[PDB]
Amino acid sequence: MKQYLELMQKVLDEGTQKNDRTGTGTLSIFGHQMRFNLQDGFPLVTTKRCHLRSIIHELLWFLQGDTNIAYLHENNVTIWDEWADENGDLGPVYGKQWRAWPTPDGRHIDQITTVLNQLKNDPDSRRIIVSAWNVGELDKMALAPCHAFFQFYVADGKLSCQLYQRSCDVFLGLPFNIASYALLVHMMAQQCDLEVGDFVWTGGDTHLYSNHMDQTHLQLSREPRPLPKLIIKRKPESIFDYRFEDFEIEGYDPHPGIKAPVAI
């Protein structure tokens, strides 16, 4: 997509070399924002082939409150295997925080149902937020939240969403995170009877790993094809009730895949 490949050239052009937690080395910039208007088409990158099956099942797993990869295995998705323990547990990462944030007085807050309630009854609230950054449980998480905090907004009967992502692997992770949140905005919008508006991505540390530079210059030499269209075939009775089969991605003709290694 035009915004994605321009972000990639910017980290190459203004990036600082940094060492990091995995010992791989990155080129990174700090602070960036881009906007995708979802009425122009589904934001799935076309300059390399992305695996829709993984993007959709991880969202569904998140909306169930799950943090164990058994579900993802039943559906042949392996994106989270290198961080799970001997039992498949990842710790209280995204699903648990979204659906059951633990309070100090022994309650648990379902943040997704709260947001859905706000979008219906008080869409002009400036408090429609989901946070996965729970300071008191960070030490029990296998990997700290990269997509940390997001906010909804309603304006001319269109729902928008802005995400703050504190760490971003541009090549491997960011095509998955842009398509995931785009899908969530369409699902929230269908449940609230709102039109889809913009997805705003904001980044903290936006980096390219040193073992991903050939892949990056390869991809960057390719022209974006027309953006795909998403068809949802059913309106379920709640957001927690969607199935993989309700989603059709139409018109996706991407350039070939580019394999790259994940830094653990």
Ligand X SMILES: *c1cc(=O)[nH]c(=O)n1[C@H]1C[C@H](O)[C@@H](COP(=O)(O)O)O1
Q: Residue 49, annotated ligand binder?
A: no
Q: Residue 208, annotated ligand binder?
A: yes
Among 177, 190, 206, 219, binds ligand PFG (CB under 6 A): 177
- Tell me the backbone φ, ψ of residue 172, rounded to 5 degrees: -95, -50
Q: How many CA atoms, within 13 angstroms, populate the side-chain half-sphere of residue 83?
A: 20
How near is the Cβ of 69 to a second copy at its closest, in Å? Answer: 22
DSSP secondary structure letter of residue 48: S
Reading the block at residue 252, the tokens are 């996706």
Q: Residue 68, annotated ligand binder?
A: no
* 204 contributes a contact to a second copy by CB under 8 A: yes
How near is the Cβ of 157 to ligand PFG at its closest, in Å? Answer: 25
Reading the block at residue 162, the tokens are 């802005």
Among 176, 181, 242, 252, binds ligand PFG (CB under 6 A): 176
Integer Cα distance of 128 and 119 in angstroms: 8
How near is the Cβ of 117 to a second copy at its closest, in Å? Answer: 14
By residue count, the chain amounts to 264
How near is the Cβ of 122 to ligand PFG at its closest, in Å? Answer: 17
Integer Cα distance of 212 and 224 in angstroms: 20
Nearer to ligand X, 65 or 236 (CB): 65
* 31 contributes a contact to a second copy by CB under 8 A: yes
Integer Cα distance of 207 and 194 in angstroms: 34
- 161 labelled catalytic: no
Integer Cα distance of 55 and 220 in angstroms: 23
CB 142 within 8 A of CB 91: yes
The stretch among 49-57, 95-103, 108-116, 119-127 that binds ligand PFG (CB under 6 A) is 49-57
**Site of tokens 């219906």:** 120
* 51 contributes a contact to ligand PFG by CB under 6 A: yes
Integer Cα distance of 47 and 6 in angstroms: 13
* Residues making contact with ligand X (CB under 6 A): 21, 126-127, 143-144, 146-147, 167-169, 173-174, 177
Reading the block at residue 157, the tokens are 């009967």
User: Does an H or E element contain 56, and which?
Assistant: helix 52-64
List the binding residues. Answer: 21, 51, 126-127, 166-169, 177, 207-209, 263
List residues binding a second copy (CB under 8 A). 16, 18-21, 28, 30-33, 35, 101-107, 109, 111, 124-127, 129, 131, 133-138, 144, 148-149, 151, 153, 155-156, 160, 162, 164, 166-167, 198, 200, 202, 204-205
Active-site annotation, residues: 146
Residue ranges in contact with ligand PFG by CB under 6 A: 51, 53-54, 78-80, 143, 169, 172-173, 176-177, 260, 262-263
